[PDB]
Amino acid sequence: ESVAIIGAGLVGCLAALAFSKEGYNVTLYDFRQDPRLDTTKNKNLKSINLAISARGIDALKSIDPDACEHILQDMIPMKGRMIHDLKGRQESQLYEAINSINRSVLNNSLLDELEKSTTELKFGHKLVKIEWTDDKQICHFAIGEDLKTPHTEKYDFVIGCDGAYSATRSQMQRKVEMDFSQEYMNLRYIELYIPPTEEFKPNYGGNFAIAPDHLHIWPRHKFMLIALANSDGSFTSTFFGSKDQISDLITSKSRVREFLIENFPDIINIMDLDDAVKRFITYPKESLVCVNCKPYDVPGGKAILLGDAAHAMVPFYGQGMNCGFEDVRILMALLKKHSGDRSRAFTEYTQTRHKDLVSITELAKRNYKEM
Ligand SMILES: Cc1cc2nc3c(=O)[nH]c(=O)nc-3n(C[C@H](O)[C@H](O)[C@H](O)COP(=O)(O)OP(=O)(O)OC[C@H]3O[C@@H](n4cnc5c(N)ncnc54)[C@H](O)[C@@H]3O)c2cc1C
Numbered sequence: 210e211s212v213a214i215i216g217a218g219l220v221g222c223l224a225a226l227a228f229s230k231e232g233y234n235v236t237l238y239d240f241r242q243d244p245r246l247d248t249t250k251n252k253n254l255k256s257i258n259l260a261i262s263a264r265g266i267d268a269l270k271s272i273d274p275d276a277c278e279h280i281l282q283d284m285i286p287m288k289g290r291m292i293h294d295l296k297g298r299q300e301s302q303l304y305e306a307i308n309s310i311n312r313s314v315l316n317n318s319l320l321d322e323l324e325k326s327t328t329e330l331k332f333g334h335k336l337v338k339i340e341w342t343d344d345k346q347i348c349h350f351a352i353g354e355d356l357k358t359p360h361t362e363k364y365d366f367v368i369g370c371d372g373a374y375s376a377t378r379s380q381m382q383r384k385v386e387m388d389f390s391q392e393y394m395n396l397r398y399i400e401l402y403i404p405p406t407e408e409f410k411p412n413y414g415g416n417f418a419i420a421p422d423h424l425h426i427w428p429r430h431k432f433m434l435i436a437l438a439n440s441d442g443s444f445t446s447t448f449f450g451s452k453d454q455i456s457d458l459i460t461s462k463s464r465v466r467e468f469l470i471e472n473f474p475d476i477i478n479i480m481d482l483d484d485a486v487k488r489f490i491t492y493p494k495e496s497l498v499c500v501n502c503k504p505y506d507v508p509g510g511k512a513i514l515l516g517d518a519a520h521a522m523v524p525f526y527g528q529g530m531n532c533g534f535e536d537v538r539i540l541m542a543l544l545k546k547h548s549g550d551r552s553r554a555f556t557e558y559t560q561t562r563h564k565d566l567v568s569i570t571e572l573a574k575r576n577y578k579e580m
Pocket of ligand 1: 216
């Protein structure tokens with residue numbers, strides 16, 4: 210059986226690994242170029258690192274335990290949160306724990322695992338149309354941003370792992386009556402950077418400016434800053450705030466700078482303030498979108514949506530990667546239970562996963578709106 214998987218993000222790569230392990234003929238499509246190549250300048254990394262949970266790790270394990278051990282070997286386990294107040298005082302609240310994993314390492318290592326299998330990788334291919342039939346599904350692509358060269362191929366089924374703006378989802382809406390909602394959040398995030406120290410810190414076991422084994426949080430009124438360690442001693446830092454508040458700041462350089470100094474006085478010693486200012490000013494104005502569907506599948510086991518394609522969530526308050534990895538594990542178990550009958554498996558997936566998904570996404574959304 211052949212399957213076309215649309216989207217080579219974290220979820221798409223895991224799904225491709227899972228299905229190739231079960232002996233399927235997998236073709237993995239993404240319109241981006243291969244991020245492993247130095248000629249690829251846009252890596253499409255939404256964040257440098259991620260918080261992976263016990264569920265997320267377990268999902269990876271059940272699909273390929275040897276690969277999981279290899280892929281996660283440099284993850285950094287957190288023992289608690291470190292709350293920084295307005296005066297820069299840090300309080301340690303030991304853990305619901307999470308570990309820091311590098312996004313590009315995770316994505317690229319999964320791609321590497323796929324190349325040890327029969328999986329066919331097709332970068333630079335943009336899905337534009339699917340023709341649904343009772344047999345094979347005809348997928349139409351456009352190759353390249355300039356030429357948009359046509360490519361077509363038939364598959365037994367299609368897996369939509371093409372993110373919040375899923376082209377597969379839209380194709381499926383023509384075939385089945387899908388309940389669907391998209392909502393643009395007022396939330397904006399800005400990626401910041403805490404460089405590694407020059408000198409090795411024996412108490413931290415590396416060149417870290419603050420404790421590498423704590424999730425750092427600067428909680429404030431209607432906004433917050435966080436920091437999560439990387440392997441090289443630096444921290445990936447993120448500012449979360451409303452688009453209006455951010456717009457009201459980026460009018461002048463001095464306004465942003467003063468804002469940072471006033472609210473996060475202890476980050477001055479460890480972060481390049483002027484670089485931080487540029488990041489506020491030149492940050493992508495694209496809104497975060499939350500989605501929900503029902504159903505997740507086309508009857509007859511012809512297609513299924515996983516990851517952000519099926520349930521894009523509010524960041525921080527929701528855990529999209531861990532949830533998406535769990536999508537894959539749950540799907541594969543249903544396929545096992547039904548001896549490969551995708552029609553029953555995909556149908557039961559929708560029937561049992563939807564209720565859990567809506568619960569999770571609503572909680573994440575409700576919590577962000579309570580700020
Ligand atoms: C700032 C931030 C921080 C986050 N932190 C965490 C965290 O700590 N822990 C956690 O669990 N989650 C976190 N998340 C959520 C997590 O990043 C996502 O849920 C996860 O990356 C979902 O991956 P995906 O494969 O489903 O979608 P995507 O990463 O969006 O991948 C979809 C892929 O499909 C491709 N594609 C799109 N359209 C087409 C097309 N028509 N044809 C071919 N290919 C196409 C795209 O190129 C893309 O590569 C965070 C999200 C953000 C924004």
